[PDB]
Structure formats: C-alpha cells, structure tokens
Amino acid sequence: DSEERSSWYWGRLSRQEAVALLQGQRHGVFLVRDSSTSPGDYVLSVSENSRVSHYIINSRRLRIGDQEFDSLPALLEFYKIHYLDTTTLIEPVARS
Ligand SMILES: [Cl-]
Ligand SMILES: [Cl-]
C-alpha cells in the first residue's frame, strides 16, 4: 500500500558496481542484482572472505546451488540463518 525505501534489491547492477558497493563492508553485507547474462535470474553479492562473493540464483522457483526457494525473500531469510561459505547474510548495503 505504501512504497518502501530502496533496500537490498538493486535491479540491473553490474558485477563491478556490486564490488564497488560491497568491498570493505563487514562480512554478510549484501545486495541482490539481476543477472547480466540470463534474463530472469539473479545474483546475490555479499562481502565475504575479505572480498566479494557472487552467488548465482537460477530461476516461484529460485535455485542457489542445491537449495531451492519459492521467492527471493525466502532465499534471503534462509541465508540469514544458514552460512553460505564463511558468512551468513547480515544486512543490505547502505545507500548514500
Ligand atoms: Cl567483517
Ligand atoms: Cl552498508
């Protein structure tokens, strides 16, 4: 009913732009961007291991590795609770 402030979703953001935003952020700081190469898919970018990880989300059916979810919020919630490689999702990257 009411529009929300922009948060974790950045639409069609390049990998380079995602890195610019996330490099140096505390581990678990993240965003989601549209796939640059595969219409319909997404990428979860997250500060991790002192660098930036980019997890491919393949598409009510969203798959990351061997884990499937029925929505992006569900996927993000799952990885707030469960580790990816070395981090969980903590919070969306802040906007200037
Ligand atoms: Cl950290
Ligand atoms: Cl931030």
Ligand at minimal distance from the CA of 26 is 1
Q: Using CA atoms, how far apart are residues 60 and 72, in angstroms rounded to an integer?
A: 9
How far, in Å, is the centroid of ligand 1 from the Cα of 92?
A: 14
Q: How far is CA 38 from CA 33, 41, 57, 68, in A?
A: 12, 6, 10, 18
Q: Using CA atoms, how far apart are residues 70 and 61, in angstroms rounded to an integer?
A: 5
What are the sequence ranges of the domains in the chain?
Answer: 1-96
Question: Among 3.40.50.150, 3.40.50.620, 3.30.505.10, 3.40.50.920, what is the CATH number of 1-96?
Answer: 3.30.505.10
Ligand at minimal distance from the CA of 22 is 2
How many angstroms is the resolution? 1.7
Largest CA distance in the chain: 39
How far, in Å, is the centroid of ligand 2 from the Cα of 89?
A: 12
Give the method of determination.
X-ray
Question: Measured in Å, how far apart are the chain's first and last C-alpha atoms?
Answer: 25
DSSP for the chain, written as a single string: --PPPP-SB-SS--HHHHHHHHTTSPTTEEEEEE-SSSTT-EEEEEEETTEEEEEEEB---EEETTEEESSHHHHHHHHHHS-SSS----EEPP--
Q: Using CA atoms, how far apart are residues 5 and 29, in angstroms rounded to an integer?
A: 17
Nearest to 29 by CA among 71, 84, 87, 82: 87
Judge whether 21 and 93 are in contact, CB under 8 Å. Answer: yes
| Residue 21 neighbours by CB under 8 Å, 6+ apart | 31, 45, 93
